[PDB]
Design an enzyme around this catalytic site. Sequence first.
Site, PDB file in Angstrom:
ATOM      1  N   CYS A 178      -5.212   1.089   4.066  1.00  0.00           N
ATOM      2  CA  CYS A 178      -5.399  -0.329   4.324  1.00  0.00           C
ATOM      3  C   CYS A 178      -6.879  -0.674   4.139  1.00  0.00           C
ATOM      4  O   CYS A 178      -7.210  -1.765   3.642  1.00  0.00           O
ATOM      5  CB  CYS A 178      -4.978  -0.683   5.744  1.00  0.00           C
ATOM      6  SG  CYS A 178      -5.636   0.538   6.837  1.00  0.00           S
ATOM      7  N   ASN A 225      -2.691  -9.082   4.855  1.00  0.00           N
ATOM      8  CA  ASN A 225      -2.327  -7.679   5.101  1.00  0.00           C
ATOM      9  C   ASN A 225      -1.991  -6.977   3.790  1.00  0.00           C
ATOM     10  O   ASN A 225      -1.952  -7.623   2.719  1.00  0.00           O
ATOM     11  CB  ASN A 225      -1.167  -7.607   6.083  1.00  0.00           C
ATOM     12  CG  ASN A 225      -1.137  -6.322   6.882  1.00  0.00           C
ATOM     13  OD1 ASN A 225      -1.861  -5.364   6.622  1.00  0.00           O
ATOM     14  ND2 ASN A 225      -0.299  -6.308   7.893  1.00  0.00           N
ATOM     15  N   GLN A 254       0.815  -1.202   0.000  1.00  0.00           N
ATOM     16  CA  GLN A 254       0.000   0.000   0.000  1.00  0.00           C
ATOM     17  C   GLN A 254       0.847   1.250   0.000  1.00  0.00           C
ATOM     18  O   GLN A 254       0.366   2.361  -0.305  1.00  0.00           O
ATOM     19  CB  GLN A 254      -0.946   0.019   1.200  1.00  0.00           C
ATOM     20  CG  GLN A 254      -0.262   0.049   2.554  1.00  0.00           C
ATOM     21  CD  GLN A 254      -1.222   0.263   3.650  1.00  0.00           C
ATOM     22  OE1 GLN A 254      -1.331   1.365   4.161  1.00  0.00           O
ATOM     23  NE2 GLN A 254      -1.950  -0.773   4.025  1.00  0.00           N
TER      24      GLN A 254
END
Length: 213
Positions: A23, A180, A17
């Site tokens: 996120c 993640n 990211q």
Amino acid sequence: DSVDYRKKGYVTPVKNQGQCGSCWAFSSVGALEGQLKKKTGKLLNLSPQNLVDCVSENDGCGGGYMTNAFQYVQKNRGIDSEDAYPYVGQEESCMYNPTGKAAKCRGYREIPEGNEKALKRAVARVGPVSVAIDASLTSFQFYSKGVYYDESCNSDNLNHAVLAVGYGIQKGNKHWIIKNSWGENWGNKGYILMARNKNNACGIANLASFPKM
Ligand SMILES: CC[C@H](NC(=O)c1ccc(OCc2ccccn2)c(C(F)(F)F)c1Cl)C(=O)C(N)=O
């Protein structure tokens, strides 16, 4: 007893990211991507830039919520593919083009607050769920292997969005499979196994949601 959607085609490759607080945007398209595989059999990378740039309820690179991205995708009558609207890792003016629409959604549902058995049912019945955790402890960030459990983790400090892509048990420890947005170098190939049925550890079932398709 066990599901892992990575092996099922519901999960796209791990993304980075960058230096944008996005996120929420990555968690949001991951949930969307899962429902498009389930609904249509195919999936493609959807566009997190589209969400950062166009979801004004949110703070762009300065933070946001998934349900808000889900509302945007509905009221907008779609979200672009990544190929249409690539990730630049910073906010710009909203430049959504309808000609590159790759998903739509009919709304969203929220997992009953704190209810881990409800999150397992959701993950089994729906697929990848967007979840919020306390991701601020140092032990989280340096995770590499095994099932994460830290009792200092604070369920009233939800700060980071990830995506539950499964659940199961490793050498006796019940877990969630968590995806993640920090590169395939983070954790274990971009993933973390978090403690399941250890009292909603890190708040994992406190602000969980999925899109309706
Ligand atoms: C900025 C960093 C960014 N985090 C967020 O965009 C974010 C900020 C606050 C927050 O929650 C705050 C909250 C939740 C419930 C009650 C009160 N306050 C949440 C979340 F997880 F809960 F949905 C997220 Cl994703 C993210 O981790 C990153 N890009 O690395």
